[PDB]
A paper describes a structure:
The causal coronavirus (SARS-CoV-2) binds host cells via a trimeric spike whose receptor binding domain (RBD) recognizes angiotensin-converting enzyme 2, initiating conformational changes that drive membrane fusion. The heavily glycosylated trimeric surface spike protein mediates viral entry into the host cell. Spike exists initially in a pre-fusion state where the domains of S1 cloak the upper portion of the spike with the relatively small (~22 kDa) S1 receptor binding domain (RBD) nestled at the tip. The RBD is predominantly in a “down” state where the receptor binding site is inaccessible; however, it appears that it stochastically flips up with a hinge-like motion transiently presenting the angiotensin-converting enzyme 2 (ACE2) receptor binding site (Roy, 2020; Song et al., 2018; Walls et al., 2020; Wrapp et al., 2020).
We determined the crystal structure of the SARS-CoV-2 spike RBD-CR3022 Fab complex (STAR Methods) to investigate the relationship between the binding epitopes of ACE2 and CR3022. Two crystal forms grew in the same drop. The solvent content of the crystal form solved first was unusually high (ca 87%), with the ACE2 binding site exposed to large continuous solvent channels within the crystal lattice. These crystals therefore offer a promising vehicle for crystallographic screening to identify potential therapeutics that could act to block virus attachment. The current analysis of this crystal form is at 4.4 Å resolution, and so, to avoid overfitting, refinement used a real-space refinement algorithm to optimize the phases (Vagabond, HMG unpublished; STAR Methods). This, together with the favorable observation to parameter ratio resulting from the exceptionally high solvent content, meant that the map was of very high quality, allowing reliable structural interpretation (STAR Methods). CR3022 attaches to the RBD surface orthogonal to the ACE2 receptor binding site. There is no overlap between the epitopes, and indeed both the Fab and ACE2 ectodomain can bind without clashing (Tian et al., 2020).
Residue numbers in the entry:
A (entry chain L): 1 to 220
B (entry chain E): 333 to 529
C (entry chain H): 1 to 133, 137 to 220
Amino acid sequence: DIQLTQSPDSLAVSLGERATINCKSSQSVLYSSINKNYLAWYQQKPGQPPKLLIYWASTRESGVPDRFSGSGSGTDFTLTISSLQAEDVAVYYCQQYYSTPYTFGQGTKVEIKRTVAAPSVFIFPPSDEQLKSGTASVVCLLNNFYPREAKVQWKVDNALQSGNSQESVTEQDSKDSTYSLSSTLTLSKADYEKHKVYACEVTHQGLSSPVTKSFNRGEC
Amino acid sequence: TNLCPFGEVFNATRFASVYAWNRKRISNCVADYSVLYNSASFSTFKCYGVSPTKLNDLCFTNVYADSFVIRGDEVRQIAPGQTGKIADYNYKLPDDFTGCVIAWNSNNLDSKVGGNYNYLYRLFRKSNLKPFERDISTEIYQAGSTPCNGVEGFNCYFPLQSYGFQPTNGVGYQPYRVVVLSFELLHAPATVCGPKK
Amino acid sequence: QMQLVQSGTEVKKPGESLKISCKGSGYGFITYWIGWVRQMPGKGLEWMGIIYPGDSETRYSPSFQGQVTISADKSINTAYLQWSSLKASDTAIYYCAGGSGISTPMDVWGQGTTVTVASTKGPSVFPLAPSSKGGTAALGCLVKDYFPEPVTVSWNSGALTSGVHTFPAVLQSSGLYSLSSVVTVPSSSLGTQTYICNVNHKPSNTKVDKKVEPKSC
């Protein structure tokens, strides 16, 4: 029973440069009859079925660019994307097909590395419709930035909020290699009408100091 | 011009008993394996270690075609890791087998009204076959303490039985023809290539 | 050559049984083994088992031994995979995948079938209305309190894709999904151009078109 560890788990590399992913198997996968290692590489993108890119360690499936290549023997294998491109961002798995049960690695995510960029920040107050139903959702948007790391702090009348908000981040944009982020503050209609200043404070690398955005309840 | 002669293996008029299984060596030709898999006239096409749809741009040092006769219930016995009369005493595959097992019914071909009795199998041997071994010996099998002297008798068996292929037989007691394509790659030239390279 | 067509998407209730199919279209199907892979939301690939339809030889992965049944019907080049009792934890996409040969690469896949086990709810849609406060300004729509995934969103009936971000859904602690779609647009557009977000939720049979505009004050 054969187990595979990939690494790294995440990998950022600049447009045009070379990504290498490693795969370790806990046992050999060499057939002697034909001198060939029984290991494949797949790529997967959202909403799509795995694509096969390389089999027998180091052979290229149809429809795969020449910049993909595989090597290795015994227990150490490598996928190499040279001249990384935009559409090459994706998750990559190594599978062994030496015997059943067949097994995959845990997956390596591959992103592009670009120059820092500060987010455009917006904030939205709850609709009036949502407030009829007794909840209040305060959204903060951070648009088109990188890198992904970014402290976002909710404040309500200048009180720091905690464990009443969730974040969500987009796929890296294909064209410009940016992310965007939503944070969302939830509280009761009662609790939202008790305070005045709703503020979202963004810290980031591309901002030399924290940007805040705010509104006062029921103004415009 | 020099296509590989899979015809004269798969469409041979007479086959061979499983104990005396036949091997054809394939060499200095180009193999069109699509002829195989685009046929609508097999019941089983089980490939281990290789994808027959992906070896017409590949080359091997040698290809072997093994041909013989068995019975329905026995086809699932030509296959790595198997045991039974045929896997143990007749024809053995290795556990790291690389190649295909192709099989079809041959009742129209290998049955008579009187009962086909020219296809034989081995019924005992003093030990299991090694992979790709072939025993054709007809020495009496000694099943008890007392030694036979090439004589059939008590606890002393002749070691081949016939199959009883009658056209009215049950679905899996009829005969199937079998071909076993096996592939090697050495540190020596290749001579067996797909039409693509 | 071979294509694998898979059965459509399934919303079941916990307890119920389920059979999904994957039908091989192409010559040579005699040589094909078919495998089943599970992908749970957000997670990697798990191989579940494989079957050779010619004689219905079946291997499983120790994680799926007992828990599912991979059958096949060789007269219609179809493979099946089936539970007798679905749990919540069976929510996932299921890909069938084929190669001529065993111990060969899986080199053809179906586009997956998604299984939901769990009950349905439709989304509330609220406007995120832009600020007044020269440059460009942002709006969009909160899509809140639905199950399960997915919703699709587009803008102006699909006539504004530029500059849009629809965000991955997150599970609220009420067990329901919420999610935001936003677009940025020039700031002089908000007097003139109309902004509608269309929200589909197939599983609940809901379609919402929502009007978005500045809050008059």
